[PDB]
Write a protein that holds these residues in place. Structure first.
Motif, PDB file in Angstrom:
ATOM      1  N   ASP A   1       0.625  -1.238   0.054  1.00  0.00           N
ATOM      2  CA  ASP A   1      -0.087  -0.081   0.021  1.00  0.00           C
ATOM      3  C   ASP A   1       0.989   1.221   0.028  1.00  0.00           C
ATOM      4  N   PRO A   2       0.843   1.988  -1.138  1.00  0.00           N
ATOM      5  CA  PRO A   2       1.596   3.265  -1.215  1.00  0.00           C
ATOM      6  C   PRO A   2       1.539   4.135   0.098  1.00  0.00           C
TER       7      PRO A   2
ATOM      8  N   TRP B   1      -3.551  12.419   0.578  1.00  0.00           N
ATOM      9  CA  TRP B   1      -2.829  11.228   0.064  1.00  0.00           C
ATOM     10  C   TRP B   1      -2.799  11.732  -1.565  1.00  0.00           C
ATOM     11  N   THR B   2      -3.818  11.816  -1.893  1.00  0.00           N
ATOM     12  CA  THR B   2      -3.930  11.853  -3.690  1.00  0.00           C
ATOM     13  C   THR B   2      -3.113  13.104  -3.939  1.00  0.00           C
ATOM     14  N   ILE B   3      -3.415  14.208  -3.194  1.00  0.00           N
ATOM     15  CA  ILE B   3      -2.790  15.490  -3.471  1.00  0.00           C
ATOM     16  C   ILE B   3      -1.306  15.522  -3.222  1.00  0.00           C
TER      17      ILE B   3
ATOM     18  N   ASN C   1       0.310   4.282 -10.149  1.00  0.00           N
ATOM     19  CA  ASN C   1      -0.203   5.629 -10.376  1.00  0.00           C
ATOM     20  C   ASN C   1      -0.026   6.430  -8.992  1.00  0.00           C
ATOM     21  N   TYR C   2       1.088   7.480  -9.579  1.00  0.00           N
ATOM     22  CA  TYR C   2       1.488   8.485  -8.457  1.00  0.00           C
ATOM     23  C   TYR C   2       0.345   9.512  -8.228  1.00  0.00           C
ATOM     24  N   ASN C   3      -0.448   9.780  -9.139  1.00  0.00           N
ATOM     25  CA  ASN C   3      -1.345  10.881  -8.690  1.00  0.00           C
ATOM     26  C   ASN C   3      -2.593  10.571  -7.861  1.00  0.00           C
ATOM     27  N   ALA C   4      -3.238   9.321  -8.237  1.00  0.00           N
ATOM     28  CA  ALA C   4      -4.226   9.035  -7.502  1.00  0.00           C
ATOM     29  C   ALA C   4      -3.441   7.947  -6.642  1.00  0.00           C
ATOM     30  N   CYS C   5      -3.277   8.353  -5.294  1.00  0.00           N
ATOM     31  CA  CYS C   5      -2.542   7.477  -4.225  1.00  0.00           C
ATOM     32  C   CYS C   5      -3.432   6.405  -3.729  1.00  0.00           C
ATOM     33  N   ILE C   6      -3.686   5.327  -4.297  1.00  0.00           N
ATOM     34  CA  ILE C   6      -4.560   4.221  -3.652  1.00  0.00           C
ATOM     35  C   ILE C   6      -3.635   2.755  -3.745  1.00  0.00           C
TER      36      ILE C   6
END
Ligand SMILES: [Mg+2]
Lengths: 419, 474
Positions: B22-23, B221-223, B433-438
């Motif tokens: 999990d990132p 997280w996402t931002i 996917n770096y941008n949407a951190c999920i």
DNA sequence: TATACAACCTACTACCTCAT
DNA sequence: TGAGGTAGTAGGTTGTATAGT
């Protein structure tokens, strides 16, 4: 000798923080004792604590939350450090970890009110720097950092509860394999009897216009009432293509390839369904793509079948489980069944505007979990079935398509413990 | 009763070569793959936009929690997570005023209204980036709601606000904003005034129009993950990727504007093990197909693409990759691949893979409210298989797909390989996917960003931009 | 310049994303 | 999280060849 950093904490209120403090600490090189890492089972559970705070605990860290100071177990845990604060006779033994933005003086326990604020409030990081920089000024013992330890724990400890487990579990598809196909697919050089202008989807049997020949699983004799003056066609004249060949690819005519024939069966399969549903007890919801089939209110006793509930109620609108039939040939020819939620303010009169329907479907979707979406479908296809093992679809009088009412079951070792 | 194999969840690697799944948890435990000197952040918004943007920088220094911190890990605080400061003291502002907003916004046309605000922002951005001695790591476009509300096609500003009647009788502002700033490389992270301050945007009832108390740390997280990635370093790497692979995502977007409805801009995105990605921009050709409703390429442009990627690869990695997988959601026509075939070195293995999210084989777990866990896969043929990039995840104790999950048909349309590795690799690629951190990416990052990218290709067509890392394309 | 057909285009719905 | 936006896929609606005047 004493090396640890015992962490005293409220659970589960400060778990997010304690689990982050210990592990950032443990990976940094410290030895952290925390109830978080163990799965104690003794009467010495508390003595373990006490033994550890007594002897080997170099630093007592306590979560200074509201819950931390009012908590019986942490106040008991605090009891020893003051008892052992003198023994060690070092002033910084106890470190309140002020993680709570909203601590009134009154909540904080008297013993730790006095002491110096370790400020996790303004940022979790600045305080980690403050907790360690304080660990520089008095020589608290350390190993060279191995974050590997850090997440050896995370991955084995915190994730112990829930991960992939060597478990067996079967899953039911929504693909419903065709069982039996008509022995031949034949193509009628209908010629003068065919009228191109006419529409056959009122011909009560699956028919389509391919070239100048006529395609269906209904034998030429089958269209009489709506198709006059066709007793004129030789029964021989028409191509009689072995279906049991078509799936294989055995059939490749340079005049038409199998990819053409595979596509062609579907409209039929899908048309055969559509006709079958004209007469199998369910009112139809029309989406542009194809039709969705939902049983009206009251048709099944108390709006339940075979114990399932395929019609229900939401707010002032009844809900009614609906399905569609995609027919796909490959890999194995099956009837696909996507599930729907139709809607009606009253028993049998469909809602006008999809915007409400869209909003209702999503609103209703939230209630149904994996168990639920499965049963109702299975039931609903158990619903339609006209005998024990399958559904019938009527391509013609002597020719039928039989789909299994129960979907392929996939068996997979590896599943998760249910929470 | 067929049988499902299971794909072990690919491990992504963070600070200190320690890899997990999990990132969000991987970053929070150790931090980023390459820790970065502090983000200098520049702002291009209303005087209000700063206070909002400043609200967030201050907010995220402190931890912010989601509704349930198992299914969505909490956000410890920017510095704790990434071990670097993204300070609100240190802002490099280029103002925009309502006068500017009102003047350009009120045009009768959406397009003359849209294209000009975008030009406003870029000049506000480009003057600062180009002119500035000081340096800003990411430019944050803080869009007042009034922009987001009206700057898209199909949004009708009333005939009673328009100051000028249309001079004569694409148009998505943000993608355009990225597309115009595309020629001079600048990281644009675009935010909404509403999102950052969502409890200060009450509705007529007095509750917030959009209420985010459930997921507020998830936002950070996402931002931050995106901002972090834009600012320079990538959060993470694929942990166990065999050396020398090349992933190529085929992107297209129909250009509607052309009278001849086959103009479709073209692209390929090159991922290795990072997902920093390289977007190779192909020029505009007749790719769309009427009869087949499909996307396809003539050899000569297709060779250029393959070479442009092989070459930029060898310039990056000093050799030609011993395996190249090209993803697209469509099958490949034999001429288009034989075009690829020729460009390719003799011993590199080229793989065309078609990831189609048709609607097949919805798998319903027999017992329990939760669905099949992600990593289950059904293998149809040695060539074609069914992958569940979606479904229950135990570390989360939640279904990724919130309904019954749809696996993805994965066919090796062209080339030959081992379907097991493919599934694997593709399962790996959702993680990047770096941008949407999920936890995972529903569609391997190769194709994940096609549709947002497709706009940006068409949105700017005059340019001939060099191959670019994602941060410019995000 | 009739139409007998070809190949578009257009709703509609299940998913899936972001001015996240 | 969710109000959004996209991506399937059929078709009926439609724009083009054929064919006969
Ligand atoms: Mg985004």
């Amino acid at each position: 000798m004493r090396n640890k950093i015992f962490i005293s904490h409220a659970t589960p209120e400060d778990d997010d923080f304690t689990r982050w403090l210990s592990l950032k600490l443990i990976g940094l090189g410290y030895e952290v004792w925390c109830d978080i890492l163990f799965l104690d089972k003794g009467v010495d559970f508390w003595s373990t604590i006490e033994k550890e705070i007594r002897e080997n605990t170099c630093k007592f860290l306590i979560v200074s939350s509201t819950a931390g100071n009012k908590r019986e177990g942490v106040l008991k845990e605090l009891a020893v450090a003051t008892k052992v604060k003198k023994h060690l006779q070092d002033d910084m033994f106890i470190i309140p970890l002020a993680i709570d933005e909203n601590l009134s003086y009154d909540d904080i326990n008297i013993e730790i009110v006095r002491l110096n604020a370790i400020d996790f409030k303004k940022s979790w990081a600045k305080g980690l720097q403050d907790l360690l920089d304080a660990f520089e000024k008095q020589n608290v013992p350390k190993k060279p950092p191995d974050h590997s330890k850090s997440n050896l724990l995370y991955q084995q400890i915190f994730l112990h509860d829930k991960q992939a487990i060597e478990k067996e579990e079967t899953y039911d598809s929504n693909w419903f394999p065709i069982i039996s196909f008509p022995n031949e697919l034949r193509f009628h050089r209908y010629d003068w009897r065919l009228p191109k202008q006419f529409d056959v989807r009122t011909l009560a049997f699956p028919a389509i216009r391919y070239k100048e020949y006529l395609c269906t699983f209904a034998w030429e004799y089958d269209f009489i009432h709506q198709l006059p003056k066709t007793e004129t066609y030789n029964g021989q004249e028409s191509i009689r293509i072995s279906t049991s060949d078509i799936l294989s690819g055995r059939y490749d005519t340079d005049f038409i390839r199998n990819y053409e024939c595979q596509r062609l069966i579907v409209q039929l399969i899908n048309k055969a369904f559509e006709l079958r549903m004209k007469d199998k007890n369910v009112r139809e919801y029309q989406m542009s793509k194809t039709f969705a089939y939902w049983i009206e209110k009251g048709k099944l006793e108390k709006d339940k079948f075979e114990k399932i509930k395929l019609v229900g109620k939401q707010k002032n609108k009844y809900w009614h489980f609906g399905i569609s039939a995609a027919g796909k040939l490959y890999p194995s020819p099956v009837l696909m069944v996507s599930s729907h939620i139709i809607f009606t303010m009253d028993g049998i009169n469909l809602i006008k505007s999809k915007s409400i329907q869209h909003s209702s479907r999503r609103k209703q979707g939230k209630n149904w979990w994996n168990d639920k979406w499965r049963e109702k479908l299975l039931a609903f296809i158990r619903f339609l079935s006209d005998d024990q093992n399958a559904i019938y679809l009527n391509v013609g009088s002597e020719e039928k398509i039989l789909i299994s009412n129960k979907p392929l079951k996939f068996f997979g070792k590896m599943s998760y413990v249910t929470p | 009763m067929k049988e499902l194999i299971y794909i072990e969840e690919p491990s992504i690697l963070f600070a200190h070569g320690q890899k997990c799944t999990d990132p969000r948890d991987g970053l929070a435990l150790f931090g980023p793959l390459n820790q970065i000197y502090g983000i200098k952040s520049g702002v291009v918004g209303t005087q209000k936009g700063l206070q909002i943007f400043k609200s967030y920088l201050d907010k995220i220094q402190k931890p912010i929690y989601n509704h349930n911190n198992i299914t969505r890990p909490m956000f410890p605080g920017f510095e704790a997570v990434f071990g670097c400061k993204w300070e609100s003291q240190n802002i490099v502002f280029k103002e925009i005023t309502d006068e500017e907003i009102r003047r350009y916004l009120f045009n009768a046309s959406t397009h003359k209204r849209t294209y000009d605000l975008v030009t406003l922002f870029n000049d506000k951005i480009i003057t600062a980036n180009k002119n500035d001695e000081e340096r800003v790591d990411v430019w944050f476009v803080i869009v007042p709601e009034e922009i987001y509300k009206y700057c898209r096609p199909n949004s009708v500003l009333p005939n009673e606000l328009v100051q000028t009647k249309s001079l004569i009788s694409d148009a998505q502002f943000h993608d355009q904003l990225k597309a115009r700033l595309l020629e001079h490389t600048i990281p644009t992270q675009i935010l909404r005034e509403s999102t950052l301050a969502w409890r200060d945007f009450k509705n007529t009832f007095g509750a917030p129009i959009r209420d985010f108390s459930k997921i507020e740390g998830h936002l950070a997280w996402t931002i931050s993950t995106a901002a972090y990635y834009k600012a320079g370093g990538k959060p993470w790497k694929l942990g166990d990727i065999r050396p020398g692979v090349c992933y190529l995502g085929l992107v297209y977007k129909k250009i509607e504007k052309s009278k001849n409805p086959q103009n479709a801009c073209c692209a390929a995105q090159m991922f290795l093990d990072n997902g920093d990605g390289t977007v190779f921009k192909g020029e505009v050709g007749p790719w769309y197909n009427p009869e087949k409703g499909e996307y396809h390429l003539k050899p000569k442009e297709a060779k250029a693409l393959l070479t442009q990627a092989l070459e930029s690869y060898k310039e990056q990695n000093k050799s030609y990759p011993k395996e190249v997988f090209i993803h697209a959601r469509t099958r490949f026509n034999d001429e288009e691949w034989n075009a690829f075939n020729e460009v390719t070195p003799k011993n590199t293995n080229l793989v065309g893979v078609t990831i189609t999210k048709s609607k097949p084989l919805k798998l319903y777990k027999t017992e329990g409210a939760f669905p099949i866990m992600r990593g289950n896969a059904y293998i149809v043929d040695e060539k074609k298989a069914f992958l569940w990039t979606l479904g229950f995840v135990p570390k989360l104790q939640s279904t990724l797909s919130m309904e019954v999950p749809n696996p993805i048909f994965i066919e090796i349309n062209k080339g030959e390989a081992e379907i097991q590795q493919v599934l694997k690799d593709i399962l790996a690629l959702t993680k990047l996917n770096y941008n949407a951190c999920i936890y995972a990416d529903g569609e391997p990052v190769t194709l994940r960003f096609a549709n947002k990218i497709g706009e940006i290709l068409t949105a700017s067509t005059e340019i001939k931009t060099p191959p670019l890392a994602f941060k410019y394309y995000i």
